[PDB]
Amino acid sequence: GSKSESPKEPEQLRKLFIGGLSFETTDESLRSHFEQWGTLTDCVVMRDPNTKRSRGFGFVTYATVEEVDAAMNARPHKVDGRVVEPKRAVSREDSQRPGAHLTVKKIFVGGIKEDTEEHHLRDYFEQYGKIEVIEIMTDRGSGKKRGFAFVTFDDHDSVDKIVIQKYHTVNGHNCEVRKALSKQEMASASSSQRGR
C-alpha cells in the first residue's frame, strides 16, 4: 500500500478480468500475485457454486487505474503455475457482445462526420494507448473518408478502455465506438492457406 491517492476511477476502470486461470487457482493466490504490482482492493476467482471449483477465470480490483496499467503492461502473467490473461473488466453493455472478453485490439468508429482524418481519431485514441495502424473506411458513393473508421491498437487494454464508453467525443463530434473483431476472429472457420 502507501500511496498519496484518492481514486477517481470506477470499479470497471480499475478492475481486471483474469482469464485462463487454473482449475485450482484460489482468490487468495490470485490477489497475492497481482498485488505485486499494486494494492488490490478486491479479488475473486469465479468458482462453481455446485462443486466449489475454479471456472478458470476471475477478477482483481486495484486501488488506482495506474496500478492496473502496470499489471497490464507486465503481461504475460502466471498465477498458480498457469499462464493467465489479465484484461479490462468490460462494461456489461459491451460484455454482452460476442468476443467481449476476448483479446480484441481493434475498435469500430461509426456515425462520423462527412469526413474524418486519421490525425483526428488517432490523436484521440492514442491517449488510451499505442496504435499500430489506422483503418480509414471510404465511402463508396461520395468517395469521402466517412461513414465509419477502424483503429488497430498494440494492446487490447487500450481498446477496452475505449469500449467501456460506447460513444466518444472526437473532433467535437460524438461518434459510436465498440469492439471490432478481426476477420479471422469473426469467421472462426478452418482457414487453410499454403501461401495462397
CATH code of the domain occupying 99-196: 3.30.70.330
Q: Which residue bears the cell 470499479?
A: 11
CATH 3.30.70.330 region(s) of the chain?
Answer: 1-98, 99-196
Query: What backbone torsions phi and psi does residue 16 show, to the nearest 5 degrees?
Result: -115, 145
Taking Cα atoms as reference points, which of 189, 6, 192, 18 lies closest to residue 90? 18
- Parallel/antiparallel/unpaired status of strands 131-137 and 148-153: antiparallel
Strand (E) positions, the chain? 15-19, 40-47, 54-62, 77-79, 82-88, 106-110, 131-137, 148-153, 167-170, 173-179
Measured from the Cβ of residue 98, the count of other Cβ atoms closer than 10 Å reads 10
Q: Which residues pair with 137 in a beta bridge?
A: 148
Taking Cα atoms as reference points, which of 150, 195, 145 lies closest to residue 176? 150
H/E stretch holding 32:
helix 27-34
Taking Cα atoms as reference points, which of 22, 17, 93 lies closest to residue 61? 17
Grid cell of 75 as nine digits:
503481461
CA distance linking residue 162 with residue 168, whole number of Å: 8
Rounded to 10 degrees, the C-alpha dihedral 123/128/134/135 comes to -120
CA distance linking residue 123 with residue 22, whole number of Å: 39
* Technique used to solve these coordinates: NMR
Per DSSP, the three-state class of 190 is coil
Do residues 103 and 87 lie in contact, with contact meaning Cβ atoms separated by under 8 Å?
A: yes
Which positions ≥6 away from 40 have C-beta within 8 Å?
31, 34, 60, 61, 62, 63
Q: Which fold has domain 1-98?
A: Alpha-Beta Plaits (3.30.70)
**Residue 132 Cα distances to 152, 155, 180, angstroms:** 6, 9, 15
Query: What backbone torsions phi and psi does residue 169 show, to the nearest 5 degrees?
Result: -95, 105
Which positions ≥6 away from 17 have C-beta within 8 Å?
57, 58, 59, 86, 87, 88, 89, 90, 101
Query: What backbone torsions phi and psi does residue 106 show, to the nearest 5 degrees?
Result: -120, 140
- Parallel/antiparallel/unpaired status of strands 82-88 and 54-62: unpaired
Taking Cα atoms as reference points, which of 170, 151, 153 lies closest to residue 113? 170
